[PDB]
Amino acid sequence: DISGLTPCKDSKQFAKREKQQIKKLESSLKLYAPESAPALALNAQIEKTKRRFDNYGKYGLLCGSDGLPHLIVNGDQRHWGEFITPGILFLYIAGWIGWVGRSYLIAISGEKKPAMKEIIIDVPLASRIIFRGFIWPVAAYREFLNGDLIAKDV
Amino acid sequence: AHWMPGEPRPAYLDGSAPGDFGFDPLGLGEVPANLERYKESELIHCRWAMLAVPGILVPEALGYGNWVTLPTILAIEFLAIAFVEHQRSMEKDPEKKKYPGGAFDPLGYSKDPKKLEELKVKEIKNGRLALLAFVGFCVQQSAYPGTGPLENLATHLADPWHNNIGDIVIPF
Amino acid sequence: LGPLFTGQWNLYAQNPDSSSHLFGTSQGSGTAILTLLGGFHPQTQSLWLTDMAHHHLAIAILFLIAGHMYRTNFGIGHSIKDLLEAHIPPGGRLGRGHKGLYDTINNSIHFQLGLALASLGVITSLVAQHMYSLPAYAFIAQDFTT
Amino acid sequence: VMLAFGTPEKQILIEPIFAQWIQSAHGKTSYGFDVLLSSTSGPAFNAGRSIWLPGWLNAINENSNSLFLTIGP
Amino acid sequence: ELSPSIVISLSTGLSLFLGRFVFFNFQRENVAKQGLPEQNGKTHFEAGDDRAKEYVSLLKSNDPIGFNIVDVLAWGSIGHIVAYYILATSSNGY
Amino acid sequence: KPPPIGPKRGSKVKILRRESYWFKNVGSVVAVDQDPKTRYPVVVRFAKVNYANISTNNYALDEVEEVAA
Amino acid sequence: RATWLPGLNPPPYLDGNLAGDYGFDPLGLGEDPESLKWYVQAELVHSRFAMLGVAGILFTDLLRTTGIRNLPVWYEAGAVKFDFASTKTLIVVQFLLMGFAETKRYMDFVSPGSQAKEGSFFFGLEAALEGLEPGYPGGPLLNPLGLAKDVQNAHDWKLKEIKNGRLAMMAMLGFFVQASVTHTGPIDNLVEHLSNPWHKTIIQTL
Amino acid sequence: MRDLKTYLSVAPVLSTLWFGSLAGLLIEINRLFPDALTFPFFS
Amino acid sequence: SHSVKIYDTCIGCTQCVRACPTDVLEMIPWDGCKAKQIASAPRTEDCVGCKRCESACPTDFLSVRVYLWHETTRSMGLAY
Amino acid sequence: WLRDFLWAQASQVIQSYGSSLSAYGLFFLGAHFVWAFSLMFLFSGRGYWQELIESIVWAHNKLKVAPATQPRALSIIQGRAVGVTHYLLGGIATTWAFFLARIIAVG
Ligand code: CLA
Ligand SMILES: CC(/C=C/C=C(C)/C=C/[C@@]12O[C@]1(C)C[C@@H](O)CC2(C)C)=C\C=C\C=C(C)\C=C\C=C(C)\C=C\[C@@]12O[C@]1(C)C[C@@H](O)CC2(C)C
Ligand SMILES: CC1=C(/C=C/C(C)=C/C=C/C(C)=C\C=C\C=C(C)\C=C\C=C(C)\C=C\C2=C(C)CCCC2(C)C)C(C)(C)CCC1
Ligand SMILES: CC1=C(C/C=C(\C)CCC[C@H](C)CCC[C@H](C)CCCC(C)C)C(=O)c2ccccc2C1=O
């Protein structure tokens, strides 16, 4: 109920959005037979919409006066599924990408012509490294403590 | 002679200073001039807090004032204290800025240097303890608005395993 | 000026145009000249002229006090050169601090111009952000193109 | 896209909680944070309780004027 | 009423006492340490500006510490300031 | 002197020249002109080219500094 | 030796002289040596805490399921309100005491001679904290029995320790996930598996 | 062939392989787990 | 017109002047390099500023260096 | 042309949000974008981007992520090529979306 936003499980305009989209998809449904592929696909999209709205209701999303879910990023424990848990889920993958790429560039750095390994990606080397970014939040922390994360100028 | 035995003591404080335990993890006292100013200010903060804490618990044990008009008492305070503080600022010898002696040292406690060093250690230890005690007073008055320090000690001694800091430090 | 010299400044905030004032006529007006009642005039949806008067007065006190800061021909005041050579942090984080900066600004007209345009642009955006929200002119909030 | 797919309920709408907090920190009761000026018990509200805050509150809460607009995603 | 003629003279005499007796040595120390407002390593008067010429005539006081008229203006500007601050903050019942 | 004056052929060297592309970057000395009249004898060979697609440049003795490795 | 999967040589930065090595470091975490030392102490402490955990869960659930004592489920065990003390006090007391323990362990790890030399007063006991080893402190306080008085030539004992502890950690992860998707105790899940093993497993949870 | 695999490991071929695999992953996730705005597990 | 300058980092490879389409440059003897020659710029009045000279100087940054300056009819390359 | 052709006949590509013609309005805005993005290339020059690239290459070399294939700003002729192709693609896809939605809607 924060920021003047009513939850979507007890919002009027949210249910109105639901009803309006369902009537829109049903207006496009009285043009085909109820057993053919178009009508079946339209009914599947209808159930998709209804479950979508009900899932946004049951997660405790906050729907404003416009009747759309307004995500809360401030750090409220009820709304960590909005930003903070998927934010950690992001940063874990993003640091995976960065860490496997960095360890790859460091792996090829001791090559005769390293640039050809950035064009012709050494798939065995990367694949042996591709899972080494699973542990990036600890390996990077140690490389920061040991001094191996940041390079020295010389 | 170390705040956490095992941590490497920095190079700039090693035990020689009166109250040296090697607690400079942020590296504030790196340069010597700031270090000297810091120990001066430390002694002054210490002496003010040690003047304060017996001016808190003694009114609370008997008076129960809870340690809680302007344009005259404020003026007399500023006049009486700015004079002393600037006259203190006008000294340039640092060991005499921390420990003037002379007209400030009657009773001859500063007559023997070894006992002078031991008493400087005593001053700084009791003073750090009193600074902690005053910060405790302030935060215990912030958390509990309308209670006294000795009142809080009675609250602890009543049921210590149920009335402690934990009630404020975690939400539960 | 009895209230001003006698210190009884509160006598200048006695009848602060008590909410029925028509801008340009004595109906619902008052006698105050300097107020801090804040908010907007109800007719104009603008700031009170007494608030602007007290405002410019207060910042006049501040600027007239601040303009007696820097050293001049009368023996007192600050030298900005030593203010800058004194603001060098021990620790070497900033390094040599603001040393030699008075000479590289005062000789450099482009540095003066850059700092001036910095401040001017920020306060111009401030003029915009505060004239749209806190209009200080009568009947400018209700007209919408200006 | 979510509008182009007729699904405006799927949009990324982040309510500006921090600017709304500053607004409620100045007397705007349109969010219900009740902090430092919308809370009557706040000492900041108690200090200027008799100086400017009546006019400033009936100004900032009045949704016709243009200071501290009701902001959204 | 705080007797607006008594508080103001009181605060002015207070500022002058705090100036001459309590800290003039600190103020004159900081004046001599900050020094003149030099440009390119020299005073403005030493750089060709005929109009600076720090007025030693106005500074030549025979008060035995050196409390010149400018320091009298300084301590007394602060005095009247604190006086009217007290008077105004005491006028309204806030 | 007729013996070498500069770094050894192969000594990885750092560049102190502020206007070069490889400033504060290591190199690899491939030659040192032993003529005691040229101004920039130290022929270095770096690993990554400059903007002109060149990996080598002459440097002076004072515009160069060998690393501890 | 036998290093955790045949057909792969162990990494050259760890081999032989370490508590239950077996050469499993495919993700290059013990590549740096001081990192490996820190991780060894981490592993030992983790495994010992996990062993105490598995004992304190299996024993309590043997008492619970059979019905010797009415102890709560491991899942719903933290919210037990004790009469003499409160959890709000217990967290703070744990913080204090385990801080005095773990910071001492740390300052020994970074400086082995510490906690026993000078001004390290713990009720006059500045001798039981000699350490003798990283991760294996010894002394009358920590090993009163002293089964392994020596510790370098105690590879059997340390190997038993680390193997039982790796297994206890894996069993603790079992307790974490097995009782978050089934919402019962470990012994309940076991006797559910030992009635119809081919019909009650992880994937028989629909 | 060694050179055919050398070409398959080239940056564009491997990029389109990687992004086709990735795109199939995200696509099948947004079909099996469509219309997702909030992470409800341990919410 | 333009101010062409040759600095002492020149190796005497004769590309600056073999690239220069307006005869601005010329190689002269010198004792600062293994080739014993350095470029000079006498005919800067004929310098258009095309910087083909310094697009062919193989040094750390440059040895030849063209400074754009007072543009006349011949530095602007006008047939009218 | 601005009123009766552009403004008016672009009332079926922008109002086509939630319709079957919604990819047309999507590419209307997108081709607008790609055209404008092209203006970053046609207007700018290589030297600024090489200096910026060398700054962020310092930021990479600080973390041992210096790529051997040296990051170079686009060649000048390449900046012009990228500009003209994004400009043409954007203007042309704008027009394509506008025409197709306009003429499919009122048909
Ligand atoms: C950067 C801005 C931005 C953001 C934040 C989003 C965000 C989102 N968009 Mg939008 N979108 C954008 C730009 C953006 N989009 C643009 C530019 C376009 C035009 C191309 C679109 C077009 C678009 C469409 C058409 C749709 C979305 C949808 C979505 C949602 C995707 C949820 C989903 O399926 O993920 C679920 C998660 C994954 C796919 C990732 C899985 C990762 C794997 C499994 C690895 C993780 C596991 C790993 C092993 C670690 C586990 C832990 C342990 C092992 C350590 C989400 C709200 C969809 C939706 O539902 O809208 C609400 C949708 O229908 N977007
Ligand atoms: C500490 C621990 C558990 C401790 C549990 C305790 C105290 C439980 C206490 C309680 O229950 C009781 C007793 C009583 C209850 O009433 C109350 C509570 C309080 C609830 C588990 C650790 C559990 C730790 C686990 C599961 C760690 C697993 C690590 C793995 C698998 C690592 C793998 C790798 O790192 C390597 C080895 C090498 C790399 O190269 C490759 C990869 C693959 C990355
Ligand atoms: C909580 C939150 C928030 C906020 C937050 C913040 C404010 C933060 C900050 C933060 C910060 C302030 C940070 C900083 C940082 C810095 C640095 C300096 C870093 C560095 C790093 C590195 C260097 C890394 C690297 C890597 C990795 C690890 C990954 C990949 C690879 C690489 C190599 C890249 C909010 C409310 C909004 C929302 C919710 C959430
Ligand atoms: C932006 C810009 C640049 C810089 C443009 C850069 C170099 C393009 C940005 C890098 C591209 C996108 C390559 C990076 C993607 C690689 C294929 C690496 C893959 C990494 C993942 C995405 C897979 C110029 O060089 C330029 C030159 C002349 C006039 C105008 C301009 C101009 O406007």
Swiss-Prot record, chain E:
Give the transmembrane ranges. 6-26, 69-89
GO biological process: what's one of them?
protein stabilization
Where located?
Plastid, Chloroplast membrane
Main location per UniProt? Answer: plastid
The answer to keyword Chaperone applying to this record is no
Specify the signal sequence span.
none
Q: How does the record classify its membrane topology? A: Multi-pass membrane protein
Alphabetic keyword roster = Chloroplast, Membrane, Photosynthesis, Photosystem I, Plastid, Transit peptide, Transmembrane, Transmembrane helix
- What Gene Ontology cellular-component terms does the record carry? chloroplast; chloroplast envelope; chloroplast membrane; chloroplast photosystem I; chloroplast thylakoid; chloroplast thylakoid membrane; nucleus; thylakoid
Give the family from UniProt. Belongs to the PsaG/PsaK family.
As for what it does, the entry says: Not yet known.
- Name used for this protein in its record: Photosystem I reaction center subunit V, chloroplastic
What portion of the full-length protein is represented by this chain?
61 to 154 of 160
UniProtKB/Swiss-Prot annotation, chain F:
Instruction: Provide one Gene Ontology biological process annotation.
Output: photosynthesis
A Gene Ontology molecular function term for this protein is: protein domain specific binding
PTM details? 2 isoforms may exist. With or without the N-terminal alanine.
**Is the keyword Transit peptide in the record?**
yes
**Keyword Transmembrane tagged:** no
| Record keywords, A-Z | Chloroplast, Membrane, Photosynthesis, Photosystem I, Plastid, Thylakoid, Transit peptide
Its job: Stabilizes the interaction between PsaC and the PSI core, assists the docking of the ferredoxin to PSI and interacts with ferredoxin-NADP oxidoreductase.
Q: What is this protein called?
A: Photosystem I reaction center subunit IV A, chloroplastic
Q: Which organism is it from?
A: Arabidopsis thaliana
The stretch of the full-length protein covered here is 75 to 143 of 143
Swiss-Prot record, chain I:
Instruction: Tell whether Ion transport is among the UniProt keywords.
Output: no
Pfam families referenced in this protein's UniProt entry, alphabetically: Fer4_21
Q: Where does [4Fe-4S] cluster 2 bind?
A: C20, C47, C50, C53
Extent of the signal sequence: none
Q: What cofactor is needed?
A: [4Fe-4S] cluster
Which Gene Ontology cellular-component terms appear in the entry? chloroplast; chloroplast stromal thylakoid; chloroplast thylakoid; chloroplast thylakoid membrane; photosystem I; plastid
Record note on cofactor: Binds 2 [4Fe-4S] clusters. Cluster 2 is most probably the spectroscopically characterized electron acceptor FA and cluster 1 is most probably FB.
Query: Which segments constitute the 4Fe-4S ferredoxin-type domain?
Result: 1-30, 38-67
Task: State if Metal-binding is listed as a keyword.
Answer: yes
Can you say where in the cell this protein is located? Answer: Plastid, Chloroplast thylakoid membrane
Q: So what does this one do? A: Apoprotein for the two 4Fe-4S centers FA and FB of photosystem I (PSI); essential for photochemical activity. FB is the terminal electron acceptor of PSI, donating electrons to ferredoxin. The C-terminus interacts with PsaA/B/D and helps assemble the protein into the PSI complex. Required for binding of PsaD and PsaE to PSI. PSI is a plastocyanin-ferredoxin oxidoreductase, converting photonic excitation into a charge separation, which transfers an electron from the donor P700 chlorophyll pair to the spectroscopically characterized acceptors A0, A1, FX, FA and FB in turn.
Report quaternary structure and partners.
Answer: The eukaryotic PSI reaction center is composed of at least 11 subunits.
Any idea what this protein is called?
Photosystem I iron-sulfur center
What organism does the record attribute this protein to?
Arabidopsis thaliana
Q: Which gene encodes it?
A: psaC
Swiss-Prot record, chain J:
Q: What is this protein called?
A: Photosystem I P700 chlorophyll a apoprotein A1
Disulphide bridges: none
What organism is recorded for this protein? Arabidopsis thaliana
| Source organism, top-level taxon | Eukaryota
Q: How does it assemble?
A: The PsaA/B heterodimer binds the P700 chlorophyll special pair and subsequent electron acceptors. PSI consists of a core antenna complex that captures photons, and an electron transfer chain that converts photonic excitation into a charge separation. The eukaryotic PSI reaction center is composed of at least 11 subunits.
State where the protein is found: Plastid, Chloroplast thylakoid membrane
- Give the binding site residues for chlorophyll a': H32
Homology family? Belongs to the PsaA/PsaB family.
Q: Which residues of the full protein are shown?
A: 644 to 750 of 750
Which lineage ranks, top first, belong to the organism behind this chain? Eukaryota, Viridiplantae, Streptophyta, Embryophyta, Tracheophyta
Report the protein's function: PsaA and PsaB bind P700, the primary electron donor of photosystem I (PSI), as well as the electron acceptors A0, A1 and FX. PSI is a plastocyanin-ferredoxin oxidoreductase, converting photonic excitation into a charge separation, which transfers an electron from the donor P700 chlorophyll pair to the spectroscopically characterized acceptors A0, A1, FX, FA and FB in turn. Oxidized P700 is reduced on the lumenal side of the thylakoid membrane by plastocyanin.
The portions of this protein that span the membrane are 21-43, 81-101
Locate the residues binding chlorophyll a.
M40, Y48
Which annotated residues bind phylloquinone?
Answer: W49
